Structure formats: structure tokens, C-alpha cells
Amino acid sequence: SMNPPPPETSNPNKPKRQTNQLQYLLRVVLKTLWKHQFAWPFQQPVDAVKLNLPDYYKIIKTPMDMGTIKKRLENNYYWNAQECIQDFNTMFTNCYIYNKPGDDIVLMAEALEKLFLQKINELPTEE
Numbered sequence: 001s002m003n004p005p006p007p008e009t010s011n012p013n014k015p016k017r018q019t020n021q022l023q024y025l026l027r028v029v030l031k032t033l034w035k036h037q038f039a040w041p042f043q044q045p046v047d048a049v050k051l052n053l054p055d056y057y058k059i060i061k062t063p064m065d066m067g068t069i070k071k072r073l074e075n076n077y078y079w080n081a082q083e084c085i086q087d088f089n090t091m092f093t094n095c096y097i098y099n100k101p102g103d104d105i106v107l108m109a110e111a112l113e114k115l116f117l118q119k120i121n122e123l124p125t126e127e
């Protein structure tokens, strides 16, 4: 054991708002990545116990996953698009930090990240 508590997805102390960019992040970016054949290892927090990765949370100190992101978006947790984009970037970076180039999980992260970059390139101007 043990896993840390997951990242928070609600906090009434955190300022938040809905923006057209955050709506795009949910409706376009997250939906595209979520349906990909390679999304599955990124859809929930790493369970280091079940996966027998005892070093995971010694190495990765700012964990993030698309389950968390989806709930943050659905819960209007974010103040702006940059906060959400930073969560996706943390998710990808963590995978590259923990694993090694050529590992299947890294190939999968790379395929998701490429789609992410393609979709974030068309992030709308703030309304």
C-alpha cells in the first residue's frame, strides 16, 4: 500500500467560472481523448497498490489523470483554461517521468498527447 487521496475535484474555497474555452476543453478536448483506444490507463488515478508500483507516489508528487480532469470540468472547478491545460500537461509529464521511452504506456501517452496538441491548437478566443 497505500495510495494518496486523489486530487480534489471540489472545493468551495476555490474561485471558479465557466468560460467558452473551458466548455471547449470538456466538449472537444476531453471527449476526443477519452474515447481513444489508448485512454484507458489515464482514465483514473494510478492505483500503485493494484499495479504493484510502490515507488510511484515517491516519484510523482503531483499526480493527475483524466478522470480527475473530467470531474473538475463537470464540476466547474477551474477558473480558466490554463489551469485545465496545466492538468493535462502534468498528466503527460508524469507518465514520461515515471516510465521509460518505448514503454507501451509512453507510446499511449504520446498518441493522446498528439491529439491533445491538435485540439488545443484550435482553442477558441475567450468570449
Ligand SMILES: COc1ccc(Br)cc1-c1nc(N)nc2[nH]cnc12
Pocket (backbone or CB within 6 Å): 040, 041, 042, 043, 044, 045, 046, 047, 051, 053, 094, 095, 098, 099, 105
Ligand atoms: C491508471 O494507470 C494504469 C492503469 C492500468 C495499468 Br495496466 C497501467 C497504468 C499505468 N501504469 C504506469 N506504469 N504508468 C502510468 N501512467 C498512467 N497510467 C499508468
